[PDB]
Design an enzyme around this catalytic site. Sequence first.
Site, short mmCIF file in Angstrom:
data_model
loop_
_atom_site.label_atom_id
_atom_site.label_comp_id
_atom_site.label_asym_id
_atom_site.label_seq_id
_atom_site.Cartn_x
_atom_site.Cartn_y
_atom_site.Cartn_z
N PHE A 21 0.88 -1.19 0.00
CA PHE A 21 0.00 0.00 0.00
C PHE A 21 0.91 1.23 0.00
O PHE A 21 1.53 1.49 1.02
CB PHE A 21 -0.94 -0.09 1.20
CG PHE A 21 -1.47 -1.47 1.47
CD1 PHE A 21 -1.97 -2.27 0.44
CD2 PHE A 21 -1.48 -1.99 2.76
CE1 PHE A 21 -2.46 -3.54 0.70
CE2 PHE A 21 -1.99 -3.26 3.02
CZ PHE A 21 -2.48 -4.03 1.99
N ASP B 78 1.67 4.23 0.78
CA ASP B 78 1.25 5.28 1.75
C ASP B 78 2.48 6.13 2.10
O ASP B 78 3.46 6.09 1.31
CB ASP B 78 0.58 4.65 2.98
CG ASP B 78 1.51 3.84 3.87
OD1 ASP B 78 2.72 3.73 3.53
OD2 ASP B 78 1.02 3.31 4.88
N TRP C 172 4.37 -1.36 8.46
CA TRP C 172 3.47 -0.31 8.98
C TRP C 172 3.52 -0.33 10.51
O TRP C 172 3.57 0.74 11.13
CB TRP C 172 2.05 -0.46 8.43
CG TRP C 172 1.20 0.74 8.70
CD1 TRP C 172 1.08 1.85 7.92
CD2 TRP C 172 0.43 0.99 9.89
NE1 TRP C 172 0.26 2.77 8.53
CE2 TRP C 172 -0.15 2.27 9.73
CE3 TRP C 172 0.17 0.26 11.05
CZ2 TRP C 172 -1.00 2.82 10.70
CZ3 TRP C 172 -0.66 0.80 12.00
CH2 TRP C 172 -1.24 2.06 11.82
#
Length: 322
Positions: free
Chosen positions: A225, A227, A298
């Site tokens: 992802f 991000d 993350w």
Amino acid sequence: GDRLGVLTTTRRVVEQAQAVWIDHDAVAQIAEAFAARQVTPPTWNRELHWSDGREALANYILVLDAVNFCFWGEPRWRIEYAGAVYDGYWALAASLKRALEQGVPLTDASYLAEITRDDVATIFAGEGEIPLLDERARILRETGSVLAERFAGRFSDAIAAAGRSAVALVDIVTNAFPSFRDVATYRGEQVRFYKRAQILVSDLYGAFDGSDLGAFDDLGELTAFADYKVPQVLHHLGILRYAPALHDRLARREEIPAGSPEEVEIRAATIWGVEELRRALASRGHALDAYQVDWLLWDEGQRLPAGTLPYHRTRTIFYLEH
């Protein structure tokens, strides 16, 4: 067989990237350390995620990931929930849980379609203000009206149509929900990312324990992802390196325009940083899907030492949805 084109299009960026590059020696060292202690990603968090019936849960996951972007800014946006203060993503999750617990029908497509600026301002009430407040109100209105129009107010109808293909569901989501369309250009070529759509599918798997609406046979086909926290962790681990002007820009917390070469390079190198770490781990007998390596990184992002280079600051744009 790259059916969304995320790996293929980001690979062209990484090969020509000026401001960002992967240290493949750092990848091997991180893989060696992570494989040695069998690092697992945290299980899908039960405490700060809302739960209920399958129809409401599916709609909750769509809403959560529809507005899952850009939490930075001064003064810091912070949320009081159940005797703890939250910021970033957890402030988002806690805010939605707080709202639903106090009877705010955020899983009802009819409420979402009509939700006003004052409704979302209240839901996200705390210290400072959630960035792009009006944007989040528009996205939630779009999300509700597409649910009511196409899916009889049930995201479960969209999930059933995917037939347990994560990749098919991402495509169904970006087709029906314009605000999930996450692409860019780099030297005139389209680059495909689909950050929030891929988070959504992995969140269904987590929330439903890989059963019923969370059952998918092809989760390995999801990428990282792209991000702002995962690249920050990859930089901290030495996997991502930044050229002089980009490094100084991040250090000074100077904002980077969405879709600019520097931003697209960070995002593309995020996808391939995670993919290269996945391959290196697999080679050392520690097999994780790319989304699991993303969750793992993350998680490391939530306890980085004081003095790590700051995360890149890009305001998410939806100019084409205005």
